[PDB]
Amino acid sequence: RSVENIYLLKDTDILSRAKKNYMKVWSYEKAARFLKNLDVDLDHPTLSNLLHNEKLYGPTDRDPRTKRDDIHYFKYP
């Protein structure tokens, strides 16, 4: 908000200085508007497949860390 939208003088706002410094400002919706020019992808189901893949690894409900004890993680050279 207040992308040169205050329409009034302000004393302790960086957006008040944005006019005098000319330093460009958009909104997040306006950020998406400009990204339309860029169009960057958001990212860079098979339930039976999910089940028979959980046959491997066990259930996937584990700690998202570097430890599972189901695999000898490399420590030494």
Place this chain on the structure above:
Amino acid sequence: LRIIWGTNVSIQECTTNFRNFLMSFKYKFRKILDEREEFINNTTDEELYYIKQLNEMRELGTSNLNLDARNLLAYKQTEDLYHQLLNYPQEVISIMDQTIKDCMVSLIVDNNLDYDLDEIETKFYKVRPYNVGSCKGMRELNPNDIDKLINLKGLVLRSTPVIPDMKVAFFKCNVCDHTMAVEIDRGVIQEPARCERIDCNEPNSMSLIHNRCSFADKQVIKLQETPDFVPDGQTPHSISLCVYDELVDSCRAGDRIEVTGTFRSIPIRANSRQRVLKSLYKTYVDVVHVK
């Protein structure tokens, strides 16, 4: 090289000998050991017994192979493996299972059979020996014969219901839902003292979920022996067989069976004070094969 501790078994040598016996066994050898050479057949004796058996094992898809120990005695190269099998049941049986899997996959590969190896390597093969020597009864088994193959024959009196046996515990962390599965090793389960996650650490977060554990069959069979020899003034004795997995619900009351298995001994807890064990061990028999 590299014999196992407490045993006379070397993994490499025993696997080599078992493969040799599998490749080059002919029933004529057993006929020779039976002194029945006048009954030698030209057809069956010529054919390779266990190679053929492994073949029909492959097509049928079974996972258990029944081995006659006297066949091992017949083969000169594996005469020592016979005694190794009697004295060391579990190790030698595992050796045999691994060798069976190896031989199956090798036989598929060598002939370049169209049959896929996906099932074979994933499957687990078991070796069930039998005809392991004489009976000797149970009055004659000294404590030095713990964990050895014994041959017992008798009448099945009573058969208990199926008793679930825990294989994998399913402790659940209350706090961060760190559900770790603990396999049982040598009949022992080790509880995580705290939460095994590093970020979350709460010892009281563990509460074992009984229902989501994975169990295995166990059936106790009461067998009253009918030994071939009976000492003076000895009333019949009852021994407690303990079958596992597929053998459960196989032997019915009143069946006259001959059973081979591992002669075990387990401490019995004096329930007067918990976690205090009697110095006299109860004796039972794990069952590997039933005839």
